[PDB]
Design a binder for this molecule. Structure first.
Ligand code: HEM
Ligand code: HEM
Ligand SMILES: CNCCN(C)c1cncc(CCc2cc(C)cc(N)n2)c1
Ligand SMILES: CNCCN(C)c1cncc(CCc2cc(C)cc(N)n2)c1
Ligand SMILES: C[C@H](O)[C@H](O)[C@H]1CNc2nc(N)[nH]c(=O)c2N1
Ligand SMILES: C[C@H](O)[C@H](O)[C@H]1CNc2nc(N)[nH]c(=O)c2N1
Ligand SMILES: [Cl-]
Ligand SMILES: [Cl-]
Lengths: 362, 362
């Protein structure tokens, strides 16, 4: 059954990919080649052009992403050649450096060797390549609660965090044939961080908030033409609400809204005062101001929705069906101020795409 | 087929209703009675207890409503006895007065005779019993754009609006056997309105905004045990975001965010300033303040979500499945600050319920 699934996905992908690349004439011969390869080897190998366009198609098909207007300019780094943990480490360090680009963030994906018999060659444990640790011991909570289980796993392996609220987790990944993952500290010179200040409220710096510049999701599987690239970290730039309305605001994350209310000088006592809403707006204004001031790329949710409208228009013009997940596309503040809130979206899954996979810790 | 549909819905409703009322022993005989009645007459008549509990069940099953905690205290007014347009008019005037209750709003539904052969006895044209007119003539826009088509229909019938931004539409409805609906001006003494002021910003009154106290949806069909009450207006009290984040803010409604920004003293020039979000928060604070100051019932979205959490807990305790429409339950500002945003809901349709029906204008 597996080989049939592979061949079927292969036929569909190659036809679509080559059509988009104006290479429809080459489909017949390429498919012939692929079927023999599947017959002999049990799998097939993407050309560099196929791999690049496939990763771009996968972003374009990501129903939950508002940032898809720019799918065709994804920078694809082919690291199917890696075989050692030092090569994986150095590739991940390089992704950080080239994606960061001194603050002018470049959307980038680095693609490692794919699974073979469903057998992973490289298994990355990090959820993002840059993320803060989290701790919870006898009532005491430190750092990012979303990272508690991964943090505990790292400390089982001999890492020790300083227990600030912003400890950088090490890179952690496992190679085929190794029983345990290895870990490596991130060099601080690779990691840009932004202190959060407010354009008008001087006291906002008293909160001592900061966040990292680049979100690099490293635990999803890229699927292209039936080939499963379980290790393929990718990044864009942040939409400010991810940081201001979720990472810093959620009660199960940094939970800062009461502290924000106090520094902006409003009471946090009555629901009818809408103090949480006001605090959210000022925190989100501070996040955008601070990234801009430091020259680190970021987009606000209004501009992002406007870009997404153009993505919808471009899909229609190209004669492609648009898919989307309304529940993720609407921003978590002022959603009805965006056009997204007022229309609906087909949430069908189209491949190539990025998928969740089981965590090897937990 | 129709009689079979009726009988099937009847069996299901009576069983469930009588179970809830501790009257399970009476189900057998009541069903026997109903089947004979259906046989002889083509339909059946609800007892007052059935009609009341059915309307309450219908609210409880309304997937789009965050306010359902209070379903069991709905005030049900049985007006199946009406036969003339004066009786309908006076019943609608009475609903307004008793629901308004001098500002201490009482959730209320008035139920008129049901359809017979799918033949309506009373057809209400208003979307809400109290709503503002809207006009659009050679580039000039006045009032509530959502009411333009109904306003034009009323003016075809000899009504004329003053063309302020807040003209009250007349009641308009049609009786079985009449070709045209009749209309009646609302007595102003029946209609409470609230001027919008801000608790701290004196200039906010310069916008000269106001809204009516009581939302009374009058164009949905109540379906109970297979009987179709197409005329059954109902009301609760407002959640403040309905007024502040939608009616007064939507670009296709009163579109006031730029004016709000100016009176609160912020620029409306850069998306990254989040001026729309800030204006939304201040407008919504003003709406809640103004209703409270005037002693007109209203709920903020935080308190409403908290009540809805209790509704979920109560459903579980009673052993009833919970249904809901996540896309409507989340509030249009700060949705991720409510528990609703972080869970999912089964959007299955359960009857009794309230349904949309075709408009007789348009
Ligand atoms: C260029 C700037 C980008 C912006 C502003 C952007 C924006 C976003 C936002 C706001 C989310 C929701 C995240 C959350 O709530 O957890 C998201 C999800 C997503 N984005 Fe993008 N994105 C960008 C680039 C990319 C790139 C380059 C890719 C892949 C090549 C990508 C793939 C996705 C995927 C797969 C998700 C869903 C993640 C999940 O299900 O947890 N995005 N995006
Ligand atoms: C007691 C106070 C109540 C509050 C605070 C409340 C809150 C709300 C809100 C905020 C909406 C969304 C409205 C929109 O965006 O257009 C809604 C929808 C709804 N509510 Fe309630 N509600 C209440 C009472 C009632 C009552 C008494 C009923 C019926 C007996 C009812 C039935 C519904 C229905 C059917 C909808 C959906 C309307 C549609 O699909 O357009 N509600 N409710
Ligand atoms: C789970 N969603 C809430 C927490 N959150 C905002 C979050 C969690 N985990 C990962 C991300 C990053 C998502 C992402 C990916 C890319 C490529 C870009 C971008 N702007 N955001 C965000
Ligand atoms: C269509 N939704 C956006 C416009 N809007 C907020 C709206 C439109 N049409 C009708 C209503 C009233 C909905 C309603 C009904 C009841 C019983 C209560 C309540 N608080 N709101 C609201
Ligand atoms: C297209 C989308 O479903 C539509 O805009 C809905 C979304 N959620 C909503 N939620 C509420 N409460 N009221 C609405 O009018 C809407 N509009
Ligand atoms: C349960 C619900 O689907 C869940 O909270 C989703 C809703 N929408 C979201 N949208 C985005 N962009 N990110 C999220 O984490 C979530 N959470
Ligand atoms: Cl993040
Ligand atoms: Cl309304």
């Amino acid at each position: 059954e597996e080989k049939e699934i592979l061949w079927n996905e292969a036929k569909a992908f190659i036809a679509a990919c080559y059509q988009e690349l104006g290479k429809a004439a080459e489909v017949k011969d390429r498919l012939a080649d692929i079927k023999s390869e599947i017959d002999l080897t049990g799998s097939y190998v993407h050309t560099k052009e196929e791999l690049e366009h496939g990763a771009k198609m996968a972003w374009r098909n990501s129903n939950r992403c508002i940032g898809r207007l720019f799918w065709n300019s994804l920078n694809v780094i082919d690291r199917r050649d890696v075989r050692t943990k030092e090569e994986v480490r150095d590739a991940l360090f390089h992704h950080i450096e080239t994606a960061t680009n001194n603050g002018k963030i470049r959307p980038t994906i680095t693609i490692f060797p794919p699974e073979e018999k469903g057998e992973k060659q490289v298994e990355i444990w990090n959820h993002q390549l840059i993320r803060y640790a989290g701790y919870e011991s006898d009532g005491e909570r430190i750092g990012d609660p979303a990272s508690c289980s991964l943090t505990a796993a790292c400390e089982e392996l001999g890492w020790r965090g300083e227990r600030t609220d912003f400890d950088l987790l090490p890179l952690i990944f496992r190679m085929k044939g190794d029983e345990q993952p290895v870990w490596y500290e991130l060099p601080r010179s690779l990691v840009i961080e932004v202190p959060i200040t407010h354009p008008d409220i001087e006291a906002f710096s008293d909160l001592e908030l900061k966040w990292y510049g680049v979100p690099i999701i490293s635990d999803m599987k890229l699927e292209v033409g039936g080939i499963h690239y379980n290790a393929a970290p990718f990044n864009g730039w942040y939409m400010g609400t991810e940081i201001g309305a979720r990472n810093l605001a959620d009660e199960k994350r940094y939970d800062k809204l009461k502290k924000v209310a106090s520094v902006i000088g409003i009471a946090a006592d009555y629901n009818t005062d809408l103090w949480k809403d006001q605090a959210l707006v000022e925190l989100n204004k501070a996040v955008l101001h601070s990234y801009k001031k430091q020259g680190v790329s970021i987009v606000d949710h209004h501009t992002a929705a406007s870009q997404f409208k153009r993505f919808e228009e471009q899909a229609e013009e190209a004669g492609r069906k648009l898919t989307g997940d309304w529940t993720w596309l609407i921003p978590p503040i002022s959603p009805a101020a965006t056009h997204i809130f007022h229309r609906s979206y087909d949430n069908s899954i189209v491949k190539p795409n990025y998928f969740y996979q089981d965590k090897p810790y937990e």
